[PDB]
Symmetry: C2
Subunit: 311 residues, 2 copies
């Protein structure tokens, strides 16, 4: 199924980062984590890499091997099946690589990401000073008006054909929504609240992420939710930076946005200052789940708290 995903904004960014930098890729040894059908391997080979190693799961690697052969790069691109953890060593006696390509960003950047895997491949195989394509992501958050969706899809559970489905409402509030929002719904300024630099970040830094955000209301309005997204930069390597956004002001990507519904709507007035804290950690019961807690104030008022689990 993933073998047929089309994300033009995504792929166009990788294409420019690689093919606009042939000078950089010429005779490098490139490793592609989670290569899928192999398009980024093909970009790397066309950019002049001398060796591309792509890793992914058995069935999709079989298809990519055929695509690489139809495109005349079997001599350059080698594709191996399995997880990075289970690979004792790279093929052909190769011990180091010059460039790691990956698509590590998950939903909300960190939900079901390949971040831990890319960091491990980096530590094992990247040469000092080698390049991660891409290497920086920045997360943004802001407040939106979203009462139609909240009434139709969250309050809906109070009266389901006359029955009380309140127990489901608590879960709807707890689960961040991966969905598109229209930029015209934004009612506050936009706050940067997280940066991940793959050049320097360490696995230990990702056990507990504690950060802050601050934005200002622009309207008299009730706020039903905060929406978050990330921008992505190919910062070291390209000769002019290449970046793309997953936010609501530009073309959609398969990451969409992430929507955090508030338990109680926030009465906002123009120039109200919302200051908050976000903690992110892997869920202890199910390590594939993500615990996200928020705490915030409006003009220094009482602390509103809310806890989320991405599952």
């Amino acid at each position: 199924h993933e073998e047929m995903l089309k994300d033009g904004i995504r792929t166009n960014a990788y294409k420019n980062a690689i093919l606009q930098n042939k000078h950089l890729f010429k005779d490098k040894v490139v490793l592609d984590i989670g290569c899928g059908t192999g398009i980024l391997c093909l970009f790397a080979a066309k950019a002049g890499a001398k060796r591309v190693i792509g890793i992914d799961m058995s069935d999709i690697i079989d298809k990519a091997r055929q695509i690489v052969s139809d495109n005349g790069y079997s001599h350059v691109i080698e594709l191996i099946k399995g997880k990075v953890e289970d690979i004792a060593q790279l093929p052909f006696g190769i011990e180091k690589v010059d460039i790691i390509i990956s698509e590590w960003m998950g939903y909300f950047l960190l939900y079901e990401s390949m971040l831990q895997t890319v960091l491990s491949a980096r530590d094992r195989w990247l040469r000092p000073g080698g390049y991660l394509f891409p290497d920086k992501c920045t997360m943004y958050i802001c407040g939106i008006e979203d009462s139609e969706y909240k009434r139709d899809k969250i309050d809906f559970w109070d009266n389901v054909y006359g029955f009380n489905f309140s127990a489901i409402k608590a879960d709807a509030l707890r689960e961040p929504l991966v969905d598109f929002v229209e930029s015209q719904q934004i009612i506050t300024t936009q706050s940067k609240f997280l940066e991940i630099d793959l050049n320097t970040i360490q696995p230990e830094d990702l056990k507990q992420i504690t950060t802050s955000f601050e934005f200002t209301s622009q309207y008299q309005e009730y706020c039903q939710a905060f929406v978050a997204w990330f921008d992505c930069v190919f910062s070291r390597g390209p000769h002019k930076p290449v970046e793309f956004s997953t936010g609501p002001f530009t073309e959609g990507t398969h990451w969409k946005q992430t929507v955090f519904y508030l338990e109680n709507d926030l009465p906002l007035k123009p120039n109200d200052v919302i200051k908050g804290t976000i903690t992110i950690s892997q869920n202890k019961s199910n390590h594939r789940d993500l615990d996200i807690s928020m705490k915030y104030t409006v003009n220094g008022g009482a602390v509103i708290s809310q806890d989320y689990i991405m599952r």
Copy 2:
């Protein structure tokens, strides 16, 4: 995740079939296969069943137990975890039930359905003459014009940033698409091609389904695909029949429609007669996959053949 699906057309049909037939449900013993959060159990209890047994998987049964308790029916509704196959016997010494409620229909009716499970629960537990809510489904097929989607999403694979992704095109053609189509795309009459009556069908009948269809072109047009859907009837039990459709002329359901792209577009003229054969069987390599082969003629011309695998 399934705990939050809203399908109004679906649920409204079950609601009318049950609550418009309190006379029938009064003091019956009802079994609900795949009950989810429990709304149909609640309908059955409100309709006057004396005992409702709901079956589903562990985590969703925990939520439904709370919803049943908040709605005052714990004395009527008992919810058990697990698969029907792994349940040695029904609770409380109950050996027979009067009514089986289920949502057995899968995509394209038969892909990942609960059909085998409901038939097994029927044979084990339904009293002779007992009721299956619902018990009949009829499948329809017709031809559509769909060149914009075919060019954008199937021909797309011939030139992916200059690269040849043909190997992916073969797979796109082989995989039926579960998606909505607009009724205005239909360019032929509609053909009934399958009926499943849970009152009489036997498991052996579902190892190889061989059936036929016939429809007539209404336009001079190229046909890119056949679309199929099913209608569903609560036939024995209700005092006036209750039915709903998953077709493109009425409100959408979560089943959408199923689209079968032709390898080569079919040149159609008004009143051309398309006669065909559909065989359906479980895939031998992966029993969760569905093999669907079609063979058809236009005015008795050469046989066009096409094979599909729903995965």
